[PDB]
Amino acid sequence: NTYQFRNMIQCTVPSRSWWDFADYGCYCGCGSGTPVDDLDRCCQVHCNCYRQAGEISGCRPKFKTYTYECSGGTLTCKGDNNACAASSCDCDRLAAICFAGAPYNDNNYNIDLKARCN
Amino acid sequence: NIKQFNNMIQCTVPARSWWDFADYGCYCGSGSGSPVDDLDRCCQVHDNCYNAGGGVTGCAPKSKTYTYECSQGTLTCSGENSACAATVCDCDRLAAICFAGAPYNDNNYNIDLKSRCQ
Numbered sequence: 001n002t003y004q005f006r007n008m009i010q011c012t013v014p015s016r017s018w019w020d021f022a023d024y025g026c027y028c029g030c031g032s033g034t035p036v037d038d039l040d041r042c043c044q045v046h047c048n049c050y051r052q053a054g055e056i057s058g059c060r061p062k063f064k065t066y067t068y069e070c071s072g073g074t075l076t077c078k079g080d081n082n083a084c085a086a087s088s089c090d091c092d093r094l095a096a097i098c099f100a101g102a103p104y105n106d107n108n109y110n111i112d113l114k115a116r117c118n
Numbered sequence: 119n120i121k122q123f124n125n126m127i128q129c130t131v132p133a134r135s136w137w138d139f140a141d142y143g144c145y146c147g148s149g150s151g152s153p154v155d156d157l158d159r160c161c162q163v164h165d166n167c168y169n170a171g172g173g174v175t176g177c178a179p180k181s182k183t184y185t186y187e188c189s190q191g192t193l194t195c196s197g198e199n200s201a202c203a204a205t206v207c208d209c210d211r212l213a214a215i216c217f218a219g220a221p222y223n224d225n226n227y228n229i230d231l232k233s234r235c236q
């Protein structure tokens with residue numbers, strides 16, 4: 001669920017408030033257009049990831065509570081997860097890991113979506 | 119679905135595009151914090167309507183395609199819509215109608231959420 005994903009982020013990127021990713025580029029906050037950079041593409045893969053999970057009957061990616069462990073840059077989705085929860089967890093985890101490897105460009109935060117992603 | 123909602127929006131507010139609402143206030147886009155104005159409220163409810171329809175079975179707002187019509191600024195959802203389509207469709211037309219009537223404040227577009235939506 002959203003809350004768990006927020007933790008993975010604080011996990012892999014402690015030097016930043018999860019808000020730094022609530023409105024970055026064209027995809028962090030999930031939309032469309034040309035990714036602005038590596039970090040934005042991370043979010044691009046994440047939204048698409050959520051979209052595939054939605055194809056599993058009864059699977060609400062923003063809400064599905066899953067089992068995971070986030071230990072100092074280390075993220076682990078637990079096996080005790082069903083198809084929906086397992087898929088969701090791998091989305092968030094991989095996105096969290098992705099953020100950790102992509103530069104964060106202050107320019108790309110809170111950009112004009114109407115003009116830049118359309 | 120969202121593709122149909124994007125267009126619903128233009129039916130009632132032709133002078134604008136859905137993009138003007140993609141990043142407005144604290145809700146038109148995703149969800150969080152305290153509404154900013156009438157418009158930012160229209161979006162709160164809309165989302166609520168959606169999560170209420172998610173309660174219908176196998177009902178996915180952003181993805182279920184409904185049968186609607188636009189005739190000179192006035193929207194109409196057709197009857198042949200399944201319980202899920204009909205609910206979503208209505209959500210969207212009420213939102214569209216709510217957007218046209220609410221004031222659009224440039225000052226509340228592209229706002230720094232990390233400071234106005236806690």
Ligand SMILES: CC(=O)N[C@@H]1[C@@H](O)[C@H](O)[C@@H](CO)O[C@H]1O
Pocket residue numbers: 002003005006018021022027028029030042043044046047
């Ligand atoms: C609270 C939270 O983490 N919300 C995430 C956001 O961080 C992420 O940037 C965005 C796009 O992929 O998807 C949202 O669901």
Ligand SMILES: [Zn+2]
Pocket residue numbers: 069071
């Ligand atoms: Zn452990």
Ligand SMILES: [Zn+2]
Pocket residue numbers: 023110111141228229
């Ligand atoms: Zn923004």
